[PDB]
Structures are given as structure tokens and as C-alpha cells.
């Protein structure tokens with residue numbers, strides 16, 4: 001949806017509500033996103049450096 | 050807020066975008082304020098009776 | 099229990115009886131241990147610009 | 148002294164403070180990462 005970014009993405013376990021699509025850290029950044037094509041839960045983690 | 054944009058609504062609005070500078074200063078001035086009482090506490094009250 | 103305001107007490111008042119031929123010599127003693135705390139270091143931190 | 152240290156929490160305030168301020172500055176430093184500073188976005192990938 002225009003949210004360009006870079007990181008390793010894997011299956012999540014954090015419970016999104018049926019209507020939410022973003023999870024934010026205390027530092028105000030998106031660490032979890034919902035796939036729009038199919039409804040699944042994912043992490044967005046920066047690849048190690 | 051009072052120093053930078055005293056008694057003006059519009060000026061108090063643009064200062065909001067700069068984040069937490071205003072909070073940072075007020076703690077810094079408070080940090081030395083409490084410390085001053087600690088000094089005169091330390092040098093004069095060596096006797097309690 | 100409630101909250102009250104008052105003037106602080108400079109301590110427990112105690113007068114001493116001076117004289118030109120009076121002395122006091124202790125006859126007993128106690129060995130008490132008192133703690134003391136001092137910081138010695140902080141958590142090191144590095145930041146990439 | 149074992150009871151004095153265990154029962155009261157204010158005894159170790161001096162050591163606790165230096166831990167706190169170090170955590171405070173880092174929190175504020177990363178908090179400024181979300182402020183626009185006068186631009187139209189705080190996300191450097193959005194403008195690009």
C-alpha cells in the first residue's frame with residue numbers, strides 16, 4: 001500500500017483484532033503488518049546488521 | 050512556551066512540531082534547582098542535636 | 099490521616115551544662131555498622147550517525 | 148544491616164538514579180525520531 005521498507009518477514013503470533021492492520025513499537029514504527037491479499041499475521045523485522 | 054511565543058496562539062502552534070524540546074529544558078532547570086538545596090543541606094547540618 | 103503544613107523543626111533541642119571544673123568520661127561503648135553507597139560507572143552506549 | 152537493606156527500598160536510591168537517567172535520554176532521543184521538524188512527514192521513505 002505504498003509502505004516501502006526493508007526487513008525479514010516471518011509468520012507472526014501477536015493477535016491482531018479483526019479490523020487492525022498495523023502494530024507499532026514504543027519508538028513509533030511498524031513492526032507487524034497484515035497481508036491484504038490474504039489475511040495472515042506477519043512480523044516486519046530488520047535483517048541483522 | 051511563555052518565553053518563545055508569549056501570549057500568541059499561532060506561535061504556540063508551530064513550536065509543537067519541534068517535539069519534546071520544551072519538556073527537555075524544564076527538567077534540566079529543575080535538576081539543578083533541587084540540587085542546590087542538597088548542597089546547603091550537606092555543609093551546615095552536620096549536627097542534628 | 100490527612101495532609102498538613104507546618105514549619106520544619108531544626109532538630110531536637112538539647113542544652114549542655116558548661117562549667118570550669120566538670121568533666122564527663124565514658125564508661126561503655128557500642129560498635130555500630132553504617133552503610134555507604136557510591137556510583138562508580140554507567141552503561142556505555144554507542145550511536146551510528 | 149541485612150534487614151535494613153532488604154526491607155527499605157529507598158536505601159539503594161543512589162544506584163537506581165544513574166540507571167534511570169540513562170534510560171530517560173535514550174527514550175527521548177528515539178522519541179524525536181517521530182517529529183516532523185516542520186516538514187510534511189516524519190517518515191523519511193514516504194517523502195522519497
Ligand SMILES: *[C@@H]1O[C@H](CO)[C@@H](O[C@@H]2O[C@H](CO)[C@@H](O)[C@H](O)[C@H]2NC(C)=O)[C@H](O)[C@H]1NC(C)=O
Pocket residue numbers: 125126127128
Ligand atoms: C555495655 O553495654 C552493653 C550493651 O550495649 C552491655 O551488654 C548488655 O548487658 C546487659 C546486662 O544488663 C545484658 O542483659 C545484655 O544482654 C548485654 N548485651 C549484649 C549484646 O550482650 C554491657 O553490660 C555494658 N557494660 C558496661 C560495663 O556498662
Ligand SMILES: *[C@@H]1O[C@H](CO)[C@@H](O)[C@H](O)[C@H]1NC(C)=O
Pocket residue numbers: 036037038
Ligand atoms: C486477491 O485474489 C485472491 C485470489 O487469489 C483472493 O483470495 C483475495 O481475496 C484477493 N484480494 C482481496 C483484497 O480480496
